[PDB]
């Protein structure tokens, strides 16, 4: 259960989980049951458009 996308991707960088493993990540104030890769894709769109909501 990750508190933020940064922590979830930090675990991926440290090799605990893969981008395709389904985990629990808190994003946008919501407890999401998704993979870090799907969370990573959300950040790609958010940073490209410079608008997270």
């Amino acid at each position: 259960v990750f508190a933020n996308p940064d922590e979830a991707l930090l675990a991926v960088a440290h090799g605990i989980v893969d981008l395709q493993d389904v985990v629990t990540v808190r994003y946008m104030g919501k407890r999401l049951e998704t993979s870090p890769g799907r969370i990573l894709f959300a950040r790609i769109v958010a940073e490209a458009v410079e608008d997270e909501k």
Partner: protein
């Protein structure tokens, strides 16, 4: 030989910064960017919560009566806590928090410990209501990188819940290598390093520590056998 590159810094606040090194020889942007990112994400010393004890709580997947947040959400908020030890010899402290409803529990509600500074005192911990009591003791250690709770498994007392220890102050590293030119040389590299940090250390300090760690490891290739 190529002229020494210019190191420019664009740092905003205390949690983000961009560092550019140009001009560089072909392939040296990748040669330098990858080691620093690995050291930044895994070797920068920091502090994190590694154990939590809450009164009347048996397991992490329970909930306290009188608070909106369950045990998991409070644990998740605790993982957001940024604390900086002011004493180099200091290794571990325990922060005590006694709260009565219906206040909104914040990081500033922790009892002040000597040589211990809460970098984010406005961080939200829990929201209480009438009749709700939150007696929590959180254990803060010193370490590097990311350690899952089940790996270290640190418990100070019975019913203590181990929590994932995000030791690394560096939140995220993203380095970019761009093609640049210096006269008739066209295969030169431009390295841009962007560092996100929790605020305990400046991204400039994190880069300095990472470079020193890499420099120290290069001295290991000195005495054969």
């Amino acid at each position: 030989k190529l002229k020494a590159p210019v190191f420019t810094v664009r740092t905003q606040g205390r949690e983000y910064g961009e560092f550019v090194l140009e001009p560089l020889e072909r392939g040296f942007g990748v040669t330098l960017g990858n080691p620093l990112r690995r050291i930044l994400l895994s070797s920068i010393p920091g502090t994190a919560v590694t154990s939590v004890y809450i009164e009347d709580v048996l397991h992490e997947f329970s909930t306290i009566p009188g608070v909106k947040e369950d045990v998991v959400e409070i644990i998740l908020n605790l993982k957001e806590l940024v604390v900086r030890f002011l004493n180099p010899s200091l290794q571990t402290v325990t922060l005590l928090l006694k709260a009565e409803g219906p206040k909104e529990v914040k990081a500033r509600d922790f009892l002040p410990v000597a040589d211990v500074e809460i970098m984010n005192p406005d961080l939200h911990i829990a929201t209480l209501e009438e009749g709700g009591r939150l007696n929590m003791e959180v254990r803060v250690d010193r370490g590097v990188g990311y350690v899952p709770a089940e790996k270290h498994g640190i418990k100070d007392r019975i019913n203590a819940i181990p929590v994932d220890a995000v030791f690394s102050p560096v939140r995220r590293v993203a380095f970019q290598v761009e093609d640049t030119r210096l006269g008739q040389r066209t295969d030169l590299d431009k390295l841009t390093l962007r560092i996100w940090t929790d605020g305990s250390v400046t991204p400039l300090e994190a880069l300095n520590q990472a470079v020193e760690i890499l420099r120290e490891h290069l001295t290991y290739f000195s005495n054969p056998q």
